[PDB]
Ligand binder design. Structure first.
Ligand code: 4CO
Ligand code: 4CO
Ligand code: 4CO
Ligand code: 4CO
Lengths: 140, 140, 140, 140
């Protein structure tokens, strides 16, 4: 179950069948201000040229940012969803792992912003994602 | 597979095994200025809350934009990779298909820029992605 | 007064003393779904290398997008403000004019999105800005 | 003026006459990895609603990031221009100063990337800008 925050008795999609569980993401640490996650590179994470697909780093970042926000706001009657993701790609990843670290930089009443760094096994900065997370009252 | 441009005799990773083949993306039209693709929504595309993951829209966008660039520049001795992807999420998608249309808006010597709209089965605009593609001389 | 929409008896800053009036922006057309604006290039719009400063195209886009939203939402008791601007720069402008055209692509209850194209005197696409406009109940 | 890097004997436009000189931007520190600048808020920086215009944060960011790149690459025969600017707006600024700190996060051969934070007099983070800078061989 990816070590995601446990905020509800039931979720619509079991984690392992999600896009996230399919490609094998796992959350390591999570606090209100910071969170980390990682994944092993396999072909399922790659595109046909053999590099990790840009959308894999975006998916990693948005799950980490979104769920770190859910962790806080769910018990407050709020829902949180990705509203925008700007990801830039500095160095490709061919194999090994991708490690993500999300740092909360603003927590507003309606929008939280996380900066997510994505590093290879050598610790080099391969991508960054700025995630903006919409926070809204839950619908009934 | 998935009807990508056939520009080389073999590829590092078989399409059906890539992230893109796993989630079921299929390219329909492709021209130097415009390309379309679509995918059937299934759990493998969703996150745990039962909506299509933002990363899925981003990966559909970047494949369509990048591969549409490859189809032109590969024979000219160039490589094309995603360098930035800014995606914004307007309406969630729970089920059906996601249909993408990529329109080329600038074709520089070093950077091509594509705007990709992602629509649900009702035609509603659920996400947009601005793809910047780096075009460089092949190393090998 | 830049032909901005007249929605209030008093504004805190006279338009001519604004950043916008300083560099000489003027709105030409405005509807709920589309709006246009232009400016003459002068040194005040340039940076020290003699090209139009990237922030000039961003300022043009955000005023056009924001105020086209104000035009609709003000009389509804709402305020509208720029929440994010992603601008990409395809060709520099040395002299002449910059013309902007803003197309509304999503109008949500809390967020409207405008795509803004910025063209030179030859009609070439020099920059694009994706403006996301936050819409909130006015404070008292 | 404004304490920019002095890398050439003359410049196309005198700084005091540029957009940047008109609004009063001043660079404080500059190193190959980090740079700071600030500006006093006056009407010339604001829009009509009395808040600092988003374009002002963007122009302060892009000048600091681009000029910090110029200071390194100019002597190597390169030019540096802003190619993308993604700025997000967290808290408005009504008066005081805006202080910017640019941190270099990637220095590629063709693209440098800078993250610029913009803070008010209380130290609060009011906007962030991700600057991508293109680095190319000079034409003349
Ligand atoms: C975008 C947003 C409204 C979203 O709020 P959020 O992320 O949920 O943050 P939160 O709602 O927690 O509020 C943070 C601060 O925003 C302000 N704010 C938020 N909502 C409101 C509201 N309904 N009414 C007044 N102020 C508000 C207020 O300063 C608040 O601080 P506090 O008084 O609550 O301590 C808020 O982050 C924000 O105000 N950001 C700054 C927006 C900004 O300054 N943009 C650039 C100026 S407007 C764009 C422009 O350049 C322009 C130029 C010419 C022209 O003619 C028109 C526009
Ligand atoms: C970024 C890039 C160089 C990339 O090139 P590209 O996407 O491959 O397009 P391509 O290289 O095909 O060339 C497009 C045009 O860019 C210009 N360009 C490209 N390479 C060069 C070069 N090496 N030298 C001079 N101009 C060039 C040239 O105008 C070209 O047209 P043409 O003469 O070739 O017909 C190009 O898209 C571009 O120049 N964009 C505009 C950049 C811009 O104007 N940004 C805003 C101004 S700089 C940032 C700023 O505000 C600032 C403020 C204060 C300050 O102190 C410093 C900076
Ligand atoms: C961002 C926002 C909430 C803002 O709303 P807006 O721009 O003001 O638009 P508006 O509020 O007019 O609502 C449009 C539609 O959004 C939905 N929506 C808006 N607010 C709500 C709400 N409070 N509750 C439920 N649905 C809402 C609803 O579908 C609405 O349609 P309608 O039922 O009202 O006709 C809305 O545009 C939106 O829902 N966009 C889509 C967000 C999305 O699908 N993102 C990607 C999935 S979440 C990110 C992710 O990938 C993830 C992955 C793994 C993981 O573990 C966690 C997350
Ligand atoms: C975009 C750019 C080429 C620009 O280069 P830069 O910012 O100047 O950095 P620089 O050129 O200094 O080189 C950085 C590294 O990039 C790689 N690189 C740069 N130029 C080249 C080249 N001509 N050929 C091969 N690799 C290169 C190389 O790894 C280099 O490290 P090194 O071997 O030089 O030490 C580089 O930053 C980069 O390669 N970024 C990563 C691009 C990326 O991985 N995007 C995601 C994958 S491609 C998009 C996608 O998902 C997709 C999916 C499906 C599909 O069918 C097609 C595409």
């Amino acid at each position: 179950g990816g070590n995601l925050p446990d905020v509800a008795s039931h979720y619509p999609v079991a984690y392992e069948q999600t896009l996230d569980g399919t490609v094998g993401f796992v959350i390591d640490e999570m606090t209100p201000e910071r969170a980390t996650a990682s994944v092993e590179v396999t072909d399922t994470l790659r595109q046909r040229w053999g590099l990790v697909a840009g959308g894999a780093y975006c998916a990693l970042a948005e799950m980490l940012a979104t769920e770190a926000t859910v962790a806080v706001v769910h018990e407050k009657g709020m829902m949180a969803v990705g509203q925008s993701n700007h990801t830039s790609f500095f160095r490709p990843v061919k194999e090994g792992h991708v490690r993500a670290e999300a740092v909360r930089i603003h927590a507003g009443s309606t929008t939280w912003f996380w900066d997510v760094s994505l590093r290879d096994d050598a610790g080099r900065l391969c991508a960054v994602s700025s995630m903006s997370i919409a926070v809204r009252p839950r619908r009934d």
